[PDB]
Structure formats: structure tokens, C-alpha cells
Amino acid sequence: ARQVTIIGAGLAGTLVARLLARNGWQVNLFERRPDPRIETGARGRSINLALAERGAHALRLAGLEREVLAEAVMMRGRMVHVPGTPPNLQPYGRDDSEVIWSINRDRLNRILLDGAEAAGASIHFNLGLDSVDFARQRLTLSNVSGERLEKRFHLLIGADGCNSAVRQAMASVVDLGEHLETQPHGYKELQITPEASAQFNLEPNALHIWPHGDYMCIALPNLDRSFTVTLFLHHQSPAPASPSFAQLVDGHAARRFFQRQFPDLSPMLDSLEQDFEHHPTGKLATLRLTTWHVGGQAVLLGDAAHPMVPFHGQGMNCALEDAVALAEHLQSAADNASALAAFTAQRQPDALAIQAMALENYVEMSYLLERELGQIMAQRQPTRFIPRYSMVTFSRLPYAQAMARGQIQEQLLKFAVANHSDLTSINLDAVEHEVTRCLPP
Ligand SMILES: Cc1cc2nc3c(=O)[nH]c(=O)nc-3n(C[C@H](O)[C@H](O)[C@H](O)COP(=O)(O)OP(=O)(O)OC[C@H]3O[C@@H](n4cnc5c(N)ncnc54)[C@H](O)[C@@H]3O)c2cc1C
Ligand SMILES: O=C(O)c1ccc(-c2ccc(Cl)c(Cl)c2)o1
């Protein structure tokens, strides 16, 4: 039986472990954190993730979809909150068949862990990868107490997240062609209780957004009517008094900021002060690699291979999509080296596409006529004019194809709106003809 060692029992690592063990591979999976299925007295702090069609499809191929969706909340659209006006629901699709799902990360990881073990994988927790000796084909692991263990490996899969230790080790033996692009926004994760969201009638079956120019909040629901809230805000003010994490010296400052800038959201954040001080501020960055593998010895996938900004909510979906593709190449290739090169060749252009579209979404949420004309064109020519957040989300269309069609649609709108102040001056039938001329079904 072919042997593989996977580092990181996250979303990509656990899924690929299941797909490989199900195909007869001897799978050993190492995770630095404890087993989350072992109940302790500690609280369960976990965020919700938006699971889209492409991510759900990957779970379907793994035979885990129904189990996952049973614990997921349906989000029919985005609920945009501008103070003074009732929330405006922008539906994601025609009906409840075009939706995305909010799933708690911890729940998903536990289901994937059970699935990988049911398929025959062996999972070892409380062991973090420290280094790799590629010549001797050995790696070193250690627990938090620093006690070290050495293991032989034949194939090494780096599914160890955006700060992959496997990636660091690979960069020592090959030039991965890394380019790091940091973003000026950080983020802070907050919470809304079930009592609070009910009291203020926050729609459970929707994704919620609080736009505010250079900063904003987003909220995803959970089964118990609580919401996970994420604040996006500049790390630093430009050189000066504009809002930034540096300007919010403590949780009391955060409250004043929210009471001023997010008045309809502050009442729902009961634990704002403590969450703001105890939850660390996250960083945003995009990391692009020219290559994802070292010969036939090691390969990266998920956040280890292509860290991206969380806008568009596609990091997990891409990671699950990576896992299916990697298992497919490994299963059917002439040899591991061929599989890893073919895997890289397939997935690298798609990762670049979603990395770019996520950043574009990041910029766009940090012109009104174009979106208004586009909303009309999407209703008049379905299957040809599909909004950006729908193509990435509701179809297994390769990311690069979603992007290519998005540019055609964006330019088409540019020509129709150019040199017009309002929509009554636009020839709607002429716009529709360009759609049929430049967008195949
Ligand atoms: C605020 C925020 C919100 C997001 N919202 C969404 C969303 O709505 N929808 C979506 O699709 N994506 C979302 N994402 C992106 C998504 O969370 C990641 O892309 C996804 O988790 C990637 O899965 P992964 O398996 O590659 O990495 P991870 O899920 O991070 O798993 C990596 C695993 O490897 C472990 N590990 C790390 N280092 C080591 C080591 N040396 N040794 C052993 N184990 C190690 C870690 O403990 C972890 O278990 C969001 C990201 C952020 C920061
Ligand atoms: O419809 C959308 O544009 C959409 C779907 C999922 C997300 C999402 C989820 C979590 C975070 Cl943190 C962010 Cl920034 C965005 O956005």
C-alpha cells in the first residue's frame, strides 16, 4: 500500500486523508492541536464559515455532505445594514436552491476527523512539525513541552495552514517563488448571543454586512441563533486620527467606536469589551507560489499553498476543492512526482484567480449605476449574465473562468454606463445584445 504523511488536521488535511485512506492508502495525519472531539471543561469558541457549492460538492464526493449540511444554516442572501434604513436583502439566487451555508468550523472539523478515521486514516494530535530533512526523508515533531519525535516519511502533504511549517521546510531545498502581499486591514472576531440577535430581529437565514467605507463588519449565523462577527479595520492610521486598531487602545475605546460608527450593531455585542481585548487582531495577506511541490517528496495545498484574504468567503471552499484534486492526481498518476506536478499545474491558475477576485472584493468593499444596470441584465439574461459573487459561489466553474466572464461583464457595464448620469438614458435592449454577443451560455 502507498504511504503518505499529512501535516495539519484542518479542513484540507482531514478531507484529503479520508479520500486517500478510502482508496487504500496508509495515511498518517499529524496535528499540533488537541483532538477537538475530546470534550473538556473549556469553552467552545469557534467561527462560522460560508460553505458554497464547490466546497459542498467536494464533501459530496467524500460522502460527508448530508452530515455537514444537517448542521449548517441556510443563507439566502446578504443583508446590508446602513443606519437609518431597514436591512436590504440581496438574494443570492432565484430560490432556495441557490444558497450558501453557514457551518461552525469546529463542527465541520469533527465531522471530517470522524470521516478520515472511518476511512482508515490514523490521526495523531498534540504533535507539531518542527523541521524536515528531505535528503534523509525524516521529519521532526514535538509537543508543547518540547519533547521531540522523529518519523520517516515517503510522501509529505503540507495542509498546515497559512503559516505552513512544511512550506518553510520546502523553501530550504527549492525556490518556491514566493511573493507576499500584505494588506493594511486587520480583523477582530466578536460574538452575538442568541438572546441579542432575537431581541433585535437579526435575520438568521442571511449573511449580514455593515459597510462603512474603509472599515466594516460581517456576521454569519449559527444553529443556535448566535452570530460570529468580524470587524475589518486598518492596523494603523495614515500619517492620522482616522479609525484604526492602534487608535482603539482598549475595549472601552472599541465600544465608543462601535457606538459611534456601528450604532445598530453595538447593542448586540454584549461582550465587545472583553472580546476586543482577549481576542488577538488578525492579519490579512496574499501569498503566491510559483511551485507547490518538491519533486515527488512533498506538496502543499489549501492555505499552506495560497493564503488569500477572506473576502468572497472562498478559502475553505478552495481548500476542499484542492483536496479532491490532489487525491485524484495521486490516485491515478504514474508516480508521485508526476501527480504533484500535474496537481500544481491544474490548481495553481485557479488559486491565482480566486486570490485576485478576493482582493478585488476586498478593495470594492473598502459605481452605483453599474451595479444597478448589472442587476437588470442578470434578470434579463440568466445563464449568460451571472453576478460575480454568484459564479464563484454557486458553480463549480473554475475560478479562472469565473474571473474571465466577470471582466467581460464588468467592461460591458462600463460601456453602457459611460457618459450617462442616470439609467433612463441607457438603451437596455442594446446592452442585452452585447450580452448575447460576448457571453456564451
Ligand atoms: C476571519 C476569517 C474568516 C474566514 N471566513 C471564510 C468563509 O466564510 N468561507 C470559506 O470558504 N473560507 C473562509 N476563511 C478562510 C478559511 O478559514 C481557510 O482558508 C481554511 O481554513 C483553509 O483550510 P486549511 O486546511 O488549508 O488550513 P487550516 O484550516 O488553517 O488547518 C491547518 C491545520 O494545520 C494545523 N497546523 C498548523 N501548523 C502545524 C504544524 N507545524 N504542525 C502540525 N499541525 C499544524 C493547524 O492546527 C490546523 O489544524 C476565513 C478566514 C479568516 C481568517
Ligand atoms: O457573498 C459574499 O460576498 C460572501 C460569502 C462569504 C463571505 C464572507 C465570509 C466571511 C468573511 Cl470574514 C468575509 Cl470578509 C466574507 O462573503
Numbering used by the authors: 6 to 244, 247 to 373, 381 to 455
Please give me the paper's original passages concerning this structure.
Kynurenine 3-monooxygenase (KMO) regulates levels of neuroactive kynurenine pathway metabolites associated with neurodegeneration. Downregulation of KMO activity shifts the flux between the two branches of the KP toward increased KYNA formation, thus generating a neuroprotective environment. The KMO reaction is a random bi–bi mechanism proceeding through a ternary complex of KMO-bound to l-KYN and NADPH (steady-state enzymatic assays are described in Supplementary Methods) with a turnover value, kcat, of 8.2 ± 0.2 s−1 and Km values for NADPH and l-KYN of 16.9 ± 1.5 and 12.1 ± 1.4 µM, respectively. We next determined crystal structures of KMO in complex with the novel inhibitors or with l-KYN to inform the design of small-molecule inhibitors capable of penetrating the blood–brain barrier.
Compounds 9, 11–13 and 16–19 are structurally similar to the KMO inhibitor 6-(3,4-dichlorophenyl) pyrimidine-4-carboxylic acid, in which the pyrimidine ring of the reported inhibitor is replaced by an isosteric furan ring in 9, 11–13 and 16–19. Consistent with the crystal structures, each compound was found to be a competitive inhibitor of l-KYN. In each case, the inhibitor was bound in the l-KYN-binding pocket, with the chlorinated aromatic moiety occupying a similar position to the substrate l-KYN aniline group. Furthermore, the carboxylate group of the inhibitor was in close proximity to PfKMO R83/Y97/N368. Notably, inhibitors 1, 4, 9, 13 do not stimulate KMO reduction by NADPH in rapid mixing stopped-flow assays. H2O2 production was not detected with compound 1 and PfKMO using a coupling reaction with o-dianisidine and horseradish peroxidase in the presence and absence of l-Kyn.
